[PDB]
Structure 1
Amino acid sequence: SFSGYLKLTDNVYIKNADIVEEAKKVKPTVVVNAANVYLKHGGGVAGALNKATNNAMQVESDDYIATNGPLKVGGSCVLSGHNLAKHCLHVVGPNVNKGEDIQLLKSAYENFNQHEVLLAPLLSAGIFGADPIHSLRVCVDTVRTNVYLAVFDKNLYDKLVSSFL
């Protein structure tokens, strides 16, 4: 199971970890991807998770988009976790760098409530441009299921822990 996490609340845990390495070690039931509406896993967490699957995530995703069309910002879909997890929950947080509504971050986190336990990154953080402190706050105030957050950046991890109210 999950090890080395700092407990923030009854159901939220956090660790300074590379989510790909964490997923390869834990093999969780669900790993969350920081997806975009097109499931184009180019960079950030998505690029890294897809590279770990040897592009199998992208091949599966392109078939999903060809059949269903794009996701909504704030929405999600469950696809295979490939070699990383049983399932991957592709969740689209708002991308501030694309001018998307930050209010959609709560809707994005609500997708996590459909899964009893998840390994996840902070939604809309990193290259999505939102304030990770705000993302952690929305996570704690929205997710009720057990969420194990992996924060890649040590300096950001320390700032998130030290400023957590």
Structure 2
Amino acid sequence: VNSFSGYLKLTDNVYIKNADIVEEAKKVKPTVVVNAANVYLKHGGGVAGALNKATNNAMQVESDDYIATNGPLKVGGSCVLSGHNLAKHCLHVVGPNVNKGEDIQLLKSAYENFNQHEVLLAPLLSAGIFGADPIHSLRVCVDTVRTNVYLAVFDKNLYDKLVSSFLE
């Protein structure tokens, strides 16, 4: 259960590893994997496309049924759906996409959703092509998340700049 291996503990509740979140999910099968989702839950590329493809589109079919019945999420919001073969549950969380003009204050609201789950495997919200400064996203995670979060960052160069900023 939640057999995370090779993480570096940054704070009492935040751990980090240079790894592909999809490979971590297949190995660990955590209770909750966080998806870096968008408001209409269309998993077209990046982390979301990679998680969806590893479920062989089961994630997208289920997401389409959620949107039909409930409408889109809001920026900073989330929903819990099945984790399929990757986890017991997937927490779809919408961080702001600053590359498309969304506000950075909503990154705190996005991280707040992690607090409803005791243990989560997660990506660095709003990083990559969402355009937020990745070190700033780590600082928001550290100040906001109180439950136990295992961050998988699939880039050694970025992993080392995060750990360097955090420890020195």
The TM-score with structure 1 as length reference comes to 0.99
Counterpart Cα distance in 2 of 1:80 and 1:113: 18
Segments of 4+ moved more than 3 angstroms: none
**Structure 2 unaligned spans of 5+:** none
Alignment: residue pair count:
165
The offset of 1:45, in angstroms, is 0.6
**RMSD between superposed Cα atoms in Å:** 0.6
Q: Deviations over 1:103-146 (max 9, x none)?
A: 10000000000000000001001121111100000000000000
Q: Deviations over 1:27-64 (max 9, x none)?
A: 00000000000000011110100000001100000010
Question: 1:19 aligns to what?
Answer: 21
Secondary structure in structure 2 of the residue aligned to 1:119 = strand
**Structure 1 unaligned spans of 5+:** none
Question: 2:46 aligns to what?
Answer: 44
Counterpart Cα distance in 1 of 2:99 and 2:73: 18
Counterpart Cα distance in 1 of 2:133 and 2:49: 20
Counterpart Cα distance in 2 of 1:47 and 1:153: 17
Secondary structure in structure 2 of the residue aligned to 1:164 = helix
- Report % sequence identity: 100
The offset of 1:98, in angstroms, is 1.3
The offset of 1:160, in angstroms, is 0.4
